[PDB]
Swiss-Prot record:
Claim: Transmembrane helix is one of the keywords in the record: no
Record protein name field: Serine/threonine-protein phosphatase
Keyword RNA-binding in record: no
Any GO BP: RNA decapping
Lineage: Viruses, Duplodnaviria, Heunggongvirae, Uroviricota, Caudoviricetes
Organism in which the protein naturally occurs: Escherichia phage lambda
Length: 219
């Protein structure tokens, strides 16, 4: 897989970005239906964390097989992948809601295992160019003051770090050069937040049912 992945927005009509799903498949589908999403024209970008804690995990993970669904891996996808790895330890994954995997029927377990393999092909960062506007999507954060396509980075920081949102909430706010807007999930909040040119759209759908989707193009 490649850390960065570029998406040419001019190839789609409307483009949306959704926060952490954690098995909230039905919630998502109803939203798309409600916003008039057309999978033959529009594009949905995901911040990752498609599985764990929630109920419809396989259904959510499977979305990565659809052309209209473009996701970046979250720390939960990583824990699942490492956990299922030949020399991996499931401990961490089970301590984060991965139990659903060991509760699947035989058929689904096989499907889940194949989908986990595909999840390991997911990028860590997505660069979306839309109308001369550049949007960067990562699960938790882009650990640099300046963004640069292809710049090597520690994946752990991209998917686990909460230091930036933490300072932003403590008053310490700073912009990230290199792109117009940054969109992350990972850290839940009652309402979508925005500090400088950074947006946080994880409104804890698995916890309360509030799943947020922001439109970044069209309409
Ligand atoms: Hg919530
Ligand atoms: Mn999450
Ligand atoms: Mn997360």
């Amino acid at each position: 897989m490649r850390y960065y992945e570029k998406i040419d927005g001019s190839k789609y009509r409307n483009i949306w970005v959704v926060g952490d799903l954690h098995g909230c498949y039905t919630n998502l589908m109803n939203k798309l239906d409600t916003i008039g999403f057309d999978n033959k024209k529009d594009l949905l970008i995901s911040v990752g964390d498609l599985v764990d804690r929630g109920a419809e995990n396989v259904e959510c993970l499977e979305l990565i097989t659809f052309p209209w669904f473009r996701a970046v891996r979250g720390n939960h996808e990583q824990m699942m992948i490492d956990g299922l790895s030949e020399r991996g330890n499931v401990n961490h994954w089970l301590l984060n809601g991965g139990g659903w995997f060991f509760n699947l029927d035989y058929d689904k377990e096989i499907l889940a295992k194949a989908l986990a393999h595909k999840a390991d092909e997911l990028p860590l960062i997505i660069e979306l160019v839309s109308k001369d506007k550049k949007y960067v999507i990562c699960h938790a954060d882009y650990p640099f003051d300046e963004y640069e396509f292809g710049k090597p980075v520690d994946h752990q920081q991209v998917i686990w770090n909460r230091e930036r949102i933490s300072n932003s909430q403590n008053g310490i706010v700073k912009e990230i050069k290199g792109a117009d807007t940054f969109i992350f999930g990972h850290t839940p909040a009652v309402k979508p937040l925005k500090f400088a040119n950074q947006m946080y759209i994880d409104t804890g759908a698995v916890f309360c049912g509030n799943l947020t989707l922001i439109q970044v193009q069209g309409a």
